[PDB]
Design a protein around this ligand. Sequence first.
Ligand SMILES: [Mg+2]
Ligand SMILES: [Mg+2]
Ligand SMILES: [Mg+2]
Ligand SMILES: [Mg+2]
Ligand SMILES: [Mg+2]
Ligand SMILES: [Mg+2]
Ligand SMILES: [Mg+2]
Ligand SMILES: [Mg+2]
Ligand SMILES: [Mg+2]
Ligand SMILES: [Mg+2]
Ligand SMILES: [Mg+2]
Ligand SMILES: [Mg+2]
Ligand SMILES: [Mg+2]
Ligand SMILES: [Mg+2]
Ligand SMILES: [Mg+2]
Ligand SMILES: [Mg+2]
Ligand SMILES: [Mg+2]
Ligand SMILES: [Mg+2]
Ligand SMILES: [Mg+2]
Ligand SMILES: [Mg+2]
Ligand SMILES: [Mg+2]
Ligand SMILES: [Mg+2]
Ligand SMILES: [Mg+2]
Ligand SMILES: [Mg+2]
Ligand SMILES: [Mg+2]
Ligand SMILES: [Mg+2]
Ligand SMILES: [Mg+2]
Ligand SMILES: [Mg+2]
Ligand SMILES: [Mg+2]
Ligand SMILES: [Mg+2]
Ligand SMILES: [Mg+2]
Ligand SMILES: [Mg+2]
Ligand SMILES: [Mg+2]
Ligand SMILES: [Mg+2]
Ligand SMILES: [Mg+2]
Ligand SMILES: [Mg+2]
Ligand SMILES: [Mg+2]
Ligand SMILES: [Mg+2]
Ligand SMILES: [Mg+2]
Ligand SMILES: [Mg+2]
Ligand SMILES: [Mg+2]
Ligand SMILES: [Mg+2]
Ligand SMILES: [Mg+2]
Ligand SMILES: [Mg+2]
Ligand SMILES: [Mg+2]
Ligand SMILES: [Mg+2]
Ligand SMILES: [Mg+2]
Ligand SMILES: [Mg+2]
Ligand SMILES: [Mg+2]
Ligand SMILES: [Mg+2]
Ligand SMILES: [Mg+2]
Ligand SMILES: [Mg+2]
Ligand SMILES: [Mg+2]
Ligand SMILES: [Mg+2]
Ligand SMILES: [Zn+2]
Lengths: 209, 100, 100, 50, 128
Amino acid sequence: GQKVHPNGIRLGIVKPWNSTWFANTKEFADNLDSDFKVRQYLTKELAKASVSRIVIERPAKSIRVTIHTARPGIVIGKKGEDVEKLRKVVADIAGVPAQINIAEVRKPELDAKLVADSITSQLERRVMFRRAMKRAVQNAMRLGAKGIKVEVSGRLGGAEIARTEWYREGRVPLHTLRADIDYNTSEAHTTYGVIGVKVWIFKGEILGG
Amino acid sequence: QRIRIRLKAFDHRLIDQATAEIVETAKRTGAQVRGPIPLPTRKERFTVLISPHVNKDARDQYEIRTHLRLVDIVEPTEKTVDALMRLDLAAGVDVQISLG
Amino acid sequence: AKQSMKAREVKRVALADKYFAKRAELKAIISDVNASDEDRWNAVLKLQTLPRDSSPSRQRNRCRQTGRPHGFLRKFGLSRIKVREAAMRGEIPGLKKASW
Amino acid sequence: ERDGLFCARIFGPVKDYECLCGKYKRLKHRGVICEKCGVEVTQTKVRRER
Amino acid sequence: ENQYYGTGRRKSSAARVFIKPGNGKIVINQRSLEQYFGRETARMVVRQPLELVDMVEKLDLYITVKGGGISGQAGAIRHGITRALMEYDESLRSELRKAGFVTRDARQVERKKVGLRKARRRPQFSKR
RNA sequence: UCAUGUUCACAUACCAAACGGCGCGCG
RNA sequence: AGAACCUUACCUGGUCUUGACAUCCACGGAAGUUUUCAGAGAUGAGAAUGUGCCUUCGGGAACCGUGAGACAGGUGCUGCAUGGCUGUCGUCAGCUCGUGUUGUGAAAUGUUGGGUUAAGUCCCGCAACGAGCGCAACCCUUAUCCUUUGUUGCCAGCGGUCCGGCCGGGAACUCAAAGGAGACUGCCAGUGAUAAACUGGAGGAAGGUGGGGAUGACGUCAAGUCAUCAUGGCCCUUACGACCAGGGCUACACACGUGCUACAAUGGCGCAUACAAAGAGAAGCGACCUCGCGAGAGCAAGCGGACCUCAUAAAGUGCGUCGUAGUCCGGAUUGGAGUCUGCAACUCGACUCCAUGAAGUCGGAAUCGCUAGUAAUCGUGGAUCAGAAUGCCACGGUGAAUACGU
Ligand SMILES: [Mg+2]
Ligand SMILES: [Mg+2]
Ligand SMILES: [Mg+2]
Ligand SMILES: [Mg+2]
Ligand SMILES: [Mg+2]
Ligand SMILES: [Mg+2]
Ligand SMILES: [Mg+2]
Ligand SMILES: [Mg+2]
Ligand SMILES: [Mg+2]
Ligand SMILES: [Mg+2]
Ligand SMILES: [Mg+2]
Ligand SMILES: [Mg+2]
Ligand SMILES: [Mg+2]
Ligand SMILES: [Mg+2]
Ligand SMILES: [Mg+2]
Ligand SMILES: [Mg+2]
Ligand SMILES: [Mg+2]
Ligand SMILES: [Mg+2]
Ligand SMILES: [Mg+2]
Ligand SMILES: [Mg+2]
Ligand SMILES: [Mg+2]
Ligand SMILES: [Mg+2]
Ligand SMILES: [Mg+2]
Ligand SMILES: [Mg+2]
Ligand SMILES: [Mg+2]
Ligand SMILES: [Mg+2]
Ligand SMILES: [Mg+2]
Ligand SMILES: [Mg+2]
Ligand SMILES: [Mg+2]
Ligand SMILES: [Mg+2]
Ligand SMILES: [Mg+2]
Ligand SMILES: [Mg+2]
Ligand SMILES: [Mg+2]
Ligand SMILES: [Mg+2]
Ligand SMILES: [Mg+2]
Ligand SMILES: [Mg+2]
Ligand SMILES: [Mg+2]
Ligand SMILES: [Mg+2]
Ligand SMILES: [Mg+2]
Ligand SMILES: [Mg+2]
Ligand SMILES: [Mg+2]
Ligand SMILES: [Mg+2]
Ligand SMILES: [Mg+2]
Ligand SMILES: [Mg+2]
Ligand SMILES: [Mg+2]
Ligand SMILES: [Mg+2]
Ligand SMILES: [Mg+2]
Ligand SMILES: [Mg+2]
Ligand SMILES: [Mg+2]
Ligand SMILES: [Mg+2]
Ligand SMILES: [Mg+2]
Ligand SMILES: [Mg+2]
Ligand SMILES: [Mg+2]
Ligand SMILES: [Mg+2]
Ligand SMILES: [Zn+2]
């Protein structure tokens, strides 16, 4: 019953775009490729620093990255040694002057991407999938999500038959376009294969737009 | 010798914000900007197959909408031209200042 | 796509970039109605001599991520599946689902 | 005003450890020279030295 | 004189009707009614409102119409004329509405749908 | 009036004010 | 969403083996350049030009070459090990939970009953009371109006005119977007359990979800995809990896699916002539003029575009002809001549011209779509793309028949 992607169905309405720049068709593909590169590099580097959302925004032949992250202190390092290194590598990849900004995620128990990452990490290091998932749901509800759903899928506990299990708490109105549903995915590369994690977090119902 | 400014953006709210800002700059700096005229939006539609392999009728139709705004300023003064040059706009809105 | 396939594509692109001026010159000579028959013949033979992968019509557009040689879209430089993934995540600015 | 008696690319940047054209604002870029205006990103302390 | 205006619209047509007292003249894009619409149905439809509200030998009409084709354009003109008449008199709303001319006919064209050969025709089906 | 359907196989389970005159005054 | 080469994964032959693609060292060399012979090419041998950016200068980094291995590589197998993505029942109205109660228990009840609704929609009842995912709404588009603004768009009223909105101008109108208003069974009468609703009518551009889209519950089919990608296991590693030229994927006794074009006069042909919408464009769209029967060629404005180009809508309308013929229907097929793209159109492109002029006279059993701007019919555009659509995705023109009923 394949469901529409909640972010993509909500862009414009309640949700913003991650990349926010204009380009004509001459420069569009190149810009997209560069963004892909920068995002890939940044994720590879800052896998341990908990990174929720890279937001690329290029004006005037210059790139401005904005890393939404749970631990700024770890992204910045002391005196900004690592941010500076990152900035320069991003600049080389793009081919323009770079500028990195860092947005601090205060509640990473409500940030879907972060939650998914945590669950996947636990799965990889062989925690009980069910336990990890339950903990994730409880924590989000405790922090004050209006609702949360978590789904894990495939070869759970190294079982020969794959199956998907999911827990829901509160309300998660997926068909409501004005519903602020944060959503993301991750993949646990276990010894028996890939295990997919999806996480929906209903923050509330935005009425402004 | 009027300065023409073409604003192009994917978001319409942003284009409105930019154009209003430009208008404010002109009207403050003493100039006769004609008006923020909305040119037509380009709805560039794309249609892709959603399945990784067969099933042809399963498809998604996306579209990018480019919004246009023509703002002309009549009589370029010193203050006006220099102000225009100084003022940098929002990143997500491509501006094109054609003098003539 | 295979690594080899991707490499082949890059090689073709590089060759095309290299030999563009020369090939254009030869073609112009061959086309030119106001030109000698012997010269034209020589030009045709020279063009044959040049490497085949210098010809732009040799290089296939492939997804810039996966290398997929079908379902390509020039504006994005990506095959349909990757375009969809990016669009849903919000990676392609301005793009969203279209209805009318 | 650039190439005047204060031009940040002649003498050095005004902001503490960050550049004038705005392109770079972190110690990682320390010692790069931009190509928007041409300033060197470095210690603003050296603006009194050069 | 007074010049009473009305915008007509139908399928993709858009008429500009300028009513003016006088003889029963119709000018559609600097052409006679018969010249422009060399069609009986079209002519009938553009006349129709005037015949209903006895002003056929009473009014000039300067028209300009853009878009659509013959039938749509005629419909648009009819709508415009009725609107203009209402502007001019405003007592005629009842007769005109009863006739059914005040209603803007909102039928346009159903878009073509992925999967479908047309708006609704699906391609021919088989079991085997 | 409507017969039939081969075998075996079902997963999950506790970043803090700056520099010069002119003065008056204190010492 | 496009196989001549490429693509390409297949075959044949020719070749390579730390490798086409990475990191790592070692040490010899700036990169790059320019040509030559042999070769189908992959390459293998040569001959020339440069031999440079930055060093605290014991050299580095950009970039080749050679040697060692660790490794690379695999469009190899398993979709019945998987993620992700998708079809499907089905845009069907359903699927559950907490607590309570009932039952030894699987379970039940809620979630049935009376009505009503497109709807588990709503009201009423009721050992249930609540909640969730679905319905609905929120989103896009279309139909009416209003405010704002007016070029590249508009021309109502003014003067001018080369009678062209073309130029002074105007901001009215169309239109262009942005923001508002509007439709809610809101008002009226009746029916109805003092109901939810239903039947009509009033106004209104729109009336009962206004039209159309997006939106696809829990799940089903060990459904589809290991060849987009990723990925567990397995397998190959002087070869199931890599490079090349040529061929194949376009074969043809035959069988089926989906289409196009027809069998004609509601038509073919000729001449004149009207009315669209939506798109695309810089290694691009290409005007004008000249040449060519034509496809096209030469020159060459413009224009990242409400400006310029693609770009002449066609069906229609008028006049003529044909007069029911295998025809002035039909265009397959083949011969000759060409054009363009392209290193290259033999296999195997598209198109043009001249010739040719098959079958086919409305299609057996059977079977499909469609309820309204729909079907039918007519053209137009786009993606992919050097070239290569009758397919796909969009756009407008004309515009029906019928629905008694289950
Ligand atoms: Mg699924
Ligand atoms: Mg879907
Ligand atoms: Mg690969
Ligand atoms: Mg090609
Ligand atoms: Mg006139
Ligand atoms: Mg089928
Ligand atoms: Mg038997
Ligand atoms: Mg049986
Ligand atoms: Mg057995
Ligand atoms: Mg081939
Ligand atoms: Mg390997
Ligand atoms: Mg492999
Ligand atoms: Mg493998
Ligand atoms: Mg399966
Ligand atoms: Mg699967
Ligand atoms: Mg299979
Ligand atoms: Mg198996
Ligand atoms: Mg219960
Ligand atoms: Mg039920
Ligand atoms: Mg029950
Ligand atoms: Mg009931
Ligand atoms: Mg409900
Ligand atoms: Mg009940
Ligand atoms: Mg709904
Ligand atoms: Mg409308
Ligand atoms: Mg006028
Ligand atoms: Mg009425
Ligand atoms: Mg009514
Ligand atoms: Mg199977
Ligand atoms: Mg595998
Ligand atoms: Mg396979
Ligand atoms: Mg293999
Ligand atoms: Mg080959
Ligand atoms: Mg071939
Ligand atoms: Mg084939
Ligand atoms: Mg059949
Ligand atoms: Mg057929
Ligand atoms: Mg047909
Ligand atoms: Mg004929
Ligand atoms: Mg015909
Ligand atoms: Mg001629
Ligand atoms: Mg355009
Ligand atoms: Mg065309
Ligand atoms: Mg005709
Ligand atoms: Mg005739
Ligand atoms: Mg016969
Ligand atoms: Mg006959
Ligand atoms: Mg028939
Ligand atoms: Mg229906
Ligand atoms: Mg058609
Ligand atoms: Mg195409
Ligand atoms: Mg093409
Ligand atoms: Mg298709
Ligand atoms: Mg149509
Ligand atoms: Zn800078």
